[PDB]
């Protein structure tokens, strides 16, 4: 998160920190959010050989009783995900066991112009490491023409988030996190520019409600 503030500890108890293993490199990182006691929503490009989910965190460098470190049994990447266009950048993670409900850990249930909020542990600048603490920022929903320069952007599948006149933005490390508009989840962080100039591209959740319901009902 660029240009944001430190979240109040444990104020977003659905938030998930993902550590992802690839075969021929060190760990990489993404965000996500708990939608059922044994399911986490995130981005398809965050898939790997194996993934560990940490719930209940604020400062990710200091172990505490609120932490739940949970095993992933299976990854459900969207079957139409395209690595060229980045269309359909969405994935469900099934947890080996159901999470415990505490003050610090719980689910987020399901229900241009206005303001929304996004949170994550990602980089705080182009040449700056990821944040030790959970950060968040308020951003403007933009009309789709603001994202024309992303040649594979589509208004039906995606949202355009962040006023180009400000520095505030999601960035690398924040992919898979939720965008909340008046307390309701409307988007998932996907991608943007290498130089971090806003706006960025988010997945539009409403389009995928049939697919999400299908996975949850059969697993
Ligand atoms: C290739 C490339 O450099 N793409 C651009 C867009 C320039 C940079 C970019 C990415 C990028 C990316 C990673 O690296 C990382 C950390 C990751 C994590 C875990 C895994 C397993 C694989 C990768 C991740 O996310 C990415 C995005 C999409 C696809 C692939 C990689 N995400 C953004 C989010 C915003 C807000 C802004 C810009 C970007
Ligand atoms: Zn704590």
Curated annotation (Swiss-Prot):
Identify the residues that the record assigns to the Peptidase S1 domain, covering every copy: 1-217
SUPFAM superfamilies for the chain: Trypsin-like serine proteases
SMART domains for this protein: Tryp_SPc
**Domain of life (superkingdom):** Eukaryota
Q: Which residues are glycosylated?
A: 59, 82
Report whether Signal shows up as a keyword of the record: yes
What cellular component terms from Gene Ontology apply here? Answer: collagen-containing extracellular matrix; cytoplasmic ribonucleoprotein granule; cytosol; extracellular region; extracellular space; secretory granule
Name the active site residues: 45 (charge relay system), 89 (charge relay system), 175 (charge relay system)
Query: What is the similarity comment for this entry?
Result: Belongs to the peptidase S1 family. Granzyme subfamily.
For this entry, the protein name equals: Chymase
């Amino acid at each position: 998160i660029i240009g944001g503030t430190e979240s109040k500890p444990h104020s977003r108890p659905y938030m998930a920190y993902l550590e992802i293993v690839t075969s021929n490199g060190p760990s990489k990182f993404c965000g996500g959010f708990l939608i059922r006691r044994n399911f986490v929503l995130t981005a398809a490009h965050c898939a790997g050989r194996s993934i560990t989910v940490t719930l209940g965190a604020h400062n990710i460098t200091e172990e505490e009783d609120t932490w739940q470190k949970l095993e992933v049994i299976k990854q459900f990447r969207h079957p139409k995900y395209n690595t060229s266009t980045l269309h359909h950048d969405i994935m469900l993670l099934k947890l080996k066991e159901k999470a415990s409900l505490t003050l610090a850990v719980g689910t987020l249930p399901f229900p241009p112009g206005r303001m929304c909020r996004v949170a994550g542990w990602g980089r705080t600048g182009v040449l700056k490491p990821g944040s030790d603490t959970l950060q968040e920022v308020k951003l403007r929903l933009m009309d789709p023409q603001a994202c024309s320069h992303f040649r594979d952007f589509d208004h039906n599948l995606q949202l355009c988030v962040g006023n180009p006149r400000k520095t505030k933005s999601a960035f690398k490390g924040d992919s898979g996190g939720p965008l909340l508009c008046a307390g309701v989840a409307q988007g998932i962080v996907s991608y943007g520019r290498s130089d971090a100039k806003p706006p960025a591209v988010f997945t539009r959740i409403s389009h995928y409600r049939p697919w999400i319901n299908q996975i949850l009902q059969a697993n």
